[PDB]
C-alpha cells in the first residue's frame, strides 16, 4: 500500500533475485539543525527506506516462484553438461548444486545486505538524535514503550549484534541482529527489550518487532520473515527437485541428446540489458523470472480515487487473475497474485478538482496534498495558466496548500477555471509499479496496428518442475519464447 502518488507501490526493484544488488545508502543530516527540521528529515528517511524495501525485498513475494524457475534452469544446464560427459551421479549433482549454491548466496546476500543497511541507518539516525539532543529517542526508536529515563547519556538503546549465516557456497555472511533495550532493569514494569532479524525473534519483552517513526511502521519482522521463509521453501524445493530430477534422468537420457553449452538463459539475457540500455530493467527481470506479461497490447489505465490516467503494459504473477478487459474496473486487493504496470511516468496526467475558486492577490489555494513529481497546471478565468510543482506549494496546516502566482499571472485577482496535474519529467522515464488500488482499463491498443481490443492475453514459458526439460524442444522453446519477448519491448 505505497504511493507515487498512485495507489501502487512504485520503483520496483526485482534485480536482487538475478544479480548482485547494491544497497541504497543513508542520508546524514547537518549538525546546525532545528528540532522541527531534524524530525522532518528523520521521518523522510524512514518513509524513503520503507518505500525502497517495499519495492524491492518486502512486497515482491509472488515473484519467488520465478527464483525457483531460475534456479532450476541454471542447475539443469550444469547437470546436462555433466550427464553428457558420462560422469558419476555424484558429479552430476555436484555441478547442479554448485549452481544453486552460487545463485542462493547471491539472492540471500542481497536480501540480508538490505536488512543490514536498514538497521545500520536506524543506528546512524539514533546517534544523530543523541548528538543533537533537542529531539528525544522516543521519536526515532519506538518499539512499544519508548521510556528512556534510566538510559545513560551518549549511549544508544540499540546494539547491532554480528550473527554468522552459513552461505551455501561455503562462505560466511555477517547478518546484523537488531537488539533494542530502553535501559530499565529486569524487574521494572517499564522494562522493554526486542531482539530480532529476518530469520527469527530472539526476545520480545513489552515490545513490538517493528519500529514506529512519525506514524510509519517499518522493520516489520512479519514482513521480512515472510520473504525469508518463502526463500527457504523455494531453495529447498529446487535442491529436492533437482535430486529427484537427476535420480530419474541418470542413465536413460543419452549423453549428447540435449546440447545447451551455448544457451543464453533468460537470467543472462536480462543482465546484458542492464549494461546495455534498450528497455526498463524491471520488466526485463520480470520476464527472466517467467512472470506472465502482455507484450502485444498497450493499456490506458485510470486510477479511481486519484483521477490519474496512464498508458502502459501489464504483468500478472498469476494469469488465473483472468483477462483484463477494457471498460471494466478491477480491485487488485481481491486478486490471487500481484498486478505490475510498466509505464512512461512522463505521461502521468489527471484532473485536479480539489482547488479553491478565488485567486486573491495572486494566491491560489488547493484543498488536498499535491503529488510528488507532478505539477498542478492552474488555468484562470482570464485564460492564463501557471504550472506549480508540488515542492512550491506552501502547507497552511489547515488541510489546505497555497502558492503566490503574483509574478506568473497578469491578472492576480481572478478565479480558477480548471486545474490538472501533469508530470514534471523532462524526458521519457519508464517505471514498474505494483497496482494496489482500484483501476479502470479505458482502452487496449494492439501494437503496431493500433487496433482497439476487448481483452488481454498473457504469455510465459513452460514452468520448470522436478521432472521436465528432458527434450531439446522444451529447451529450444525456452530460449526462443524469451528472446522474442525481449524483442517485443524493443
Residue numbers in the entry: 9 to 498
Question: What does the original paper state about this entry?
Answer:
To determine the low-resolution structure and oligomeric state of VP5 on the HRPV-6 surface, we used cryo-electron tomography and sub-tomogram averaging. This was facilitated by Volta phase plate technology, which provided sufficient contrast in the tomographic reconstructions for identification and alignment of the relatively small VP5 (~57 kDa) spikes. Each virion (N = 247) had 35 ± 7 VP5 spikes on the surface and each spike is a monomer with the characteristic triangular shape reminiscent of that seen in the high-resolution X-ray structures. Although the fitting is generally robust (cross-correlation coefficient 0.84), there is additional density in the groove between the N- and C-terminal domains, which slightly protrudes from the EM density, suggesting that VP5 attached to the viral membrane may adopt a more compact conformation than in the crystal. In this model, rigid body fitting placed Val461 close to the membrane but this assertion remains to be validated experimentally. The variable, putative receptor binding N2 subdomain is located at the top of the spike.
The virions contain two major protein species, a spike protein (VP4 and VP4-like proteins) protruding from the membrane surface and a smaller membrane associated protein (VP3 and VP3-like proteins) residing mostly inside the virion. Here we describe crystallographic structures of VP4-like spike proteins from two pleolipoviruses, HRPV-2 and HRPV-6, showing that these proteins have a unique fold, different from class I–III fusion proteins.
